[PDB]
Design a protein around this ligand. Structure first.
Ligand code: SF4
Ligand code: SF4
Ligand code: FES
Ligand code: FES
Ligand SMILES: [Xe]
Ligand SMILES: [Xe]
Ligand SMILES: [Xe]
Ligand SMILES: [Xe]
Ligand SMILES: [Xe]
Ligand SMILES: [Xe]
Ligand SMILES: [Xe]
Ligand SMILES: [Xe]
Ligand SMILES: [Xe]
Ligand SMILES: [Xe]
Ligand SMILES: [Xe]
Ligand SMILES: [Xe]
Ligand SMILES: [Xe]
Ligand SMILES: [Xe]
Ligand SMILES: [Xe]
Ligand SMILES: [Xe]
Ligand SMILES: [Xe]
Ligand SMILES: [Xe]
Ligand SMILES: [Xe]
Ligand SMILES: [Xe]
Ligand SMILES: [Xe]
Ligand SMILES: [Xe]
Ligand SMILES: [Xe]
Ligand SMILES: [Xe]
Lengths: 621, 621
């Protein structure tokens, strides 16, 4: 119960307890207390002269690694590899989008098209493709593919999308040695620098961690966002629903999980073919019901309006309802426990990526050339599993909650009539005091979504508009804050802006990769006003993060000039020097810093105080 | 004393003890016993739902990570990131060589030339540069640079040098999903796969670890070896000396450390300019004495005959002599303790790489455009530090030992008269029963070089020729086994081959990156005979390894078909499934497996038994 604020979770936790199904919360208890040295970051296993631990003991022993490395170096190396794994999670996704677009450009991807040709030509023109407005769309696409691949090579001095950042920002990065040059290159160089006897200076290591994260935010993730919109459509505001109640007892229920629209968009197509709709009827189902999980669910919500069943700590509970007929997983944040919990039921657990292998799963590998054929086979697996569902163990605990989604930057600018001018006018007038992107996961160390939702309500009450991505999407949707009626929960200034646009006070801007949309928006406003991103009344927050991907997002926010709140510290407190740099030193290096505060009200105060400081620097009330 | 077999080390350990200078051996004692979970690999810190440890306890708790990951997945992920860090250590070195050659090709690198134009044209032709034999050398170089950079991109289906492998080998890799596609790409994908909720199947993870290592051996390292020979000269057999006695009391002593010939070759040039030789005389020195450490020392030994002061556990002791006037470091295996030990003396510790930063060092950053100017400034720093040397604390403990070095494959084939035919004839006749590459470091858990040298003597007595790289170079040289006279220590068949060629029974083939020479030679013989590398009477051994780089070398040897002995296990024993795959399962996957044996005599038996098996499979006595 105290594990979550949500009734639908609470009900499924009782159901799981009675059936003796162990959950992430149960295993989190088993791993408590954790190893102290792992939690502090003062442990190293980068060579077998060790493994080493750094201690603060009276006799003086164990203050240095066998190689002589101290706490500062070891902590910074561990944090660098942490960030690099998060950036890698995003880079490989962007790489898959490049490969998908090239297959469409070559005409080798049945059932795929370029859905947004206008955006294709705009992005291609922006990155330097000649005559992108009038040449055949497939040739334009092939040239865009080439530019994107060059960003995954080793010959550029700066990533292609980095030119969106204001000049003052790029100058700073260049002087600091932070300019990201290559998406994979920066990940590789981080792993190199953290090999023993390479980079042994915590400052140097932290700078390359910022460079690696930037290579994600302005590289892997931004390529991923923009190419997804080209292939699958630019999101436009639309209405949908959220929570475990989006599962229907009377339908074939197919859950997509992971991050890859290249599968999920084609699964959705397969369920619309009239022979497939027929086979589910011949199996007894009223319809075929696709619902989203995690980031692929965020993206299907943004682009098609597909309902979202839950966020990260909802994933196990989504199966305990007994109505999940199949989970279609690709990669990232897919808990391996799901395979065991699925085995307690009729549910098919289907993996589709050669990168996302799970011992004991039904592997049906999906690629652009065979996706239309394989996704149909996958949905046929779900309809068979539907026939084997046990009615005595089905309990869909909730009623779904209405939400509005689809706020790409293109839609935001559309709602403002093509210019950011009305937006900037509202901020100058003090109607919107600032903006905070609330992103990041759930973490069983925090009562699920308590901090996410509490921070959101506080911010909008203070006339701070919230941009929601990732797991916060489900949190704010279940709270009722993703509809225009929620204007009544915002302070007077934000409410009046919200009702004049007919938008909610919390704008869903997509998956964790779509945090690149927030970079793009900040950069646009900074460029429009002639100032740095670190002059904008903005902030970021991850009240309940857990993953390396979220830490990379937090790092590229900070390095880009955005104050960034974290509910929980990364494993760095064993070095006061690294800690002090993350919380303070970075402020006069990149114009922003990390804030660690588990009390969401105090988080709101801190985020709001930074916004006020930036308002005054801009000459605003 | 019992820390090393060597008199020169032993003496310097007494000197360090009397001066109260703590050494790697002392800190190794402090970190003993290590954490059991780190040593077993059953600990995970890849997200802050944890950190987690996997246990085998009666109540059943702590058998799974919070995410549900078990021991098999966690161990395999830790090992994958280990291997990826080793591959990254080599990839970035190869990247720097590409950048150096491009600067030479553009004419933007004063004091650099293409030293081996014949090799440039041969390698360029081999990789597909059109008309590489007759076009201007700089244009050929620019096209080679482009091909190498493409291997550091994301659009190839197989690395360029992989075509050296026999077809049967490439077919196997392709069917297994092991084909390396991109040097940085495979490192990035490994970091992605090991993010939580991605690749959760130990088999899948181990295969991508093999793919990542292959991307090093046939990619990062092979590009690095071949481009170094193009820029700095192909090694030819020559005579030199080894051990701390290569330091001269009467000279300005400059120690190069790390991996980068781009600095060390230019430091050597600076010490030959007549104004620099003059300034050391005006400071009182008889000459300027350059001596090598680690892999840059191996390479300077191979290409210029520069004496080598020591290997990895000699590095601290090289400073305790009191005669080190400067250490010129770049990156990898440079212990941060050296900076503190240098502070106990007059010694200048100079870093030259933006990747190899050390807190408290004199940073003089070297790049191809300014290397000739910066390396001169560096040698001027050494001559100043020479003037401040304390004669009362100088003790050069040994007399140097004569060695022969410089056995590139080009030199081996040269000594055989241009064909491998006489080599193959000796193996068929049973004069050379097989070959073992003994590579890898020192590790203070093993009495220094006891196992390296003991294994070498056993192998050559058994008519098994040894190919030495890395730290083993110093070990076999100090033992007296790197001269043609050492034929008297080999069995009758090898001795007779050795004396007919005037070569030693142990061939120095270079630094740790030059293990790519061994891949090239194996592939050449396999291609010549029409068989796989896993049919050759070959083996590899790392009796005293410590680094991720060495583990990557061991992995790409195994994946390439070469039985590989390790003196110490990597941190994997907490999973019997991963362990059994490394020691046994790999044998029927890739035709070779890891052997873990700390008794070097038993190691010799195991390596020899594999060679006998392959001999019979070939129809040999
Ligand atoms: S790199 Fe240094 S601190 Fe890390 S395990 Fe090796 S010896 Fe210990
Ligand atoms: S990835 Fe899984 S095993 Fe590793 S720390 Fe996170 S929860 Fe624990
Ligand atoms: Fe966990 S040391
Ligand atoms: Fe070391 S858990
Ligand atoms: Xe920093
Ligand atoms: Xe908006
Ligand atoms: Xe906005
Ligand atoms: Xe807005
Ligand atoms: Xe603004
Ligand atoms: Xe923001
Ligand atoms: Xe914003
Ligand atoms: Xe972080
Ligand atoms: Xe964040
Ligand atoms: Xe962000
Ligand atoms: Xe940091
Ligand atoms: Xe932080
Ligand atoms: Xe494997
Ligand atoms: Xe030889
Ligand atoms: Xe050889
Ligand atoms: Xe030989
Ligand atoms: Xe051979
Ligand atoms: Xe070998
Ligand atoms: Xe060989
Ligand atoms: Xe290894
Ligand atoms: Xe090895
Ligand atoms: Xe090797
Ligand atoms: Xe392995
Ligand atoms: Xe191993």
């Amino acid at each position: 119960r105290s594990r979550s604020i949500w009734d639908d979770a609470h009900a499924m936790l009782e159901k799981a307890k009675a059936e003796g199904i162990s959950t992430v919360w149960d295993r989190a208890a088993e791993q408590t207390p954790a190893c102290k040295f792992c939690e502090l970051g003062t442990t190293c296993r980068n060579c077998i002269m060790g493994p080493c631990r750094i201690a603060n003991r009276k006799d003086g022993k164990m203050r240095l690694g066998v190689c002589g490395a101290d706490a500062d170096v070891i902590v910074a190396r561990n944090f660098g590899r942490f960030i690099a794994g998060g950036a890698a999670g995003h880079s490989d996704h962007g790489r898959d989008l490049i490969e998908t677009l090239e297959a469409v450009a070559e005409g080798k991807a049945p059932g795929y098209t370029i859905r947004d040709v206008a955006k294709l030509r705009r992005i291609a023109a922006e990155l330097g493709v000649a005559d992108a407005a009038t040449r055949p769309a497939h040739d334009v696409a092939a040239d865009l593919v080439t530019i994107c691949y060059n960003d995954f090579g080793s010959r550029r001095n700066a990533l292609a999308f980095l030119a969106r950042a204001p000049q003052v920002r790029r100058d700073l990065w260049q002087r600091l040695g932070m300019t990201p040059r290559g998406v994979d290159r920066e990940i590789a160089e981080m792993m190199h620098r953290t090999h023993m006897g390479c980079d042994n200076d915590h400052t140097s290591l932290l700078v390359h961690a910022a460079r690696t994260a930037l290579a994600d935010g302005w590289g892997g993730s931004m390529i991923g966002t923009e190419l997804s919109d080209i292939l699958f459509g630019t999101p436009r505001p639309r209405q949908s629903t959220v929570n475990l109640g989006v599962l229907r007892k009377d339908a074939v229920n197919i859950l997509v999980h992971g991050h890859n629209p290249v599968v999920s968009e084609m699964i959705l197509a397969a369920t619309r073919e009239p022979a497939v709709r027929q086979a589910a009827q011949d199996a007894g189902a009223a319809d075929i019901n696709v619902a989203g999980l995690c980031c692929t669910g965020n993206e299907l919500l943004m682009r098609q309006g597909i309902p979202m069943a839950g966020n990260h700590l909802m994933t196990e509970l989504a199966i305990v309802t007994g109505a999940a007929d199949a989970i279609v997983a690709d990669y990232q944040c897919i808990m391996p426990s799901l395979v065991q919990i699925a085995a307690c039921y009729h549910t098919r657990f289907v993996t589709t990526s050669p990168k996302g292998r799970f011992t004991g799963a039904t592997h049906v590998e999906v690629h652009p050339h065979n996706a239309q054929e394989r996704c149909r086979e996958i949905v046929m697996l779900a309809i068979d599993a539907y026939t084997r569902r046990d009615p005595a163990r089905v309990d869909i605990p909730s009623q779904p909650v209405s939400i509005m989604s689809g706020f790409s930057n293109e839609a935001i600018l559309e709602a403002l009539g093509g210019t950011p001018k009305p937006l900037i006018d509202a901020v100058v007038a003090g109607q919107i005091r600032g903006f905070v992107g609330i992103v990041g996961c759930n973490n069983p160390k925090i009562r699920q979504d308590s901090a996410n939702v509490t921070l959101t309500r506080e911010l909008i009450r203070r006339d701070i508009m919230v941009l929601a991505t990732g797991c916060v999407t489900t949190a704010a949707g279940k709270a009722g804050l993703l509809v225009p009626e929620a204007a009544s929960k915002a302070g007077e200034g934000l409410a009046a802006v919200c009702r004049s646009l007919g938008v909610p006070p919390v704008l869903h801007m997509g998956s964790c990769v779509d945090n690149s949309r927030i970079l793009q928006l900040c950069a646009l406003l900074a460029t429009t006003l002639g100032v740095d991103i670190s002059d904008l009344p903005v902030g970021a927050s991850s009240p309940e993060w857990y993953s390396e991907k979220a830490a990379a997002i937090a790092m590229y926010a900070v390095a880009s000039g955005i104050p960034t709140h974290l509910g929980l510290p990364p494993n760095i407190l064993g070095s006061e020097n690294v800690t002090a740099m993350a919380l303070h030193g970075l402020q006069d290096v990149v114009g922003a810093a990390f804030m660690v505060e588990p009390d969401p009200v105090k988080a709101a105060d801190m985020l709001e105080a930074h916004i006020v400081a930036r308002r005054a620097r801009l000459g605003l009330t």
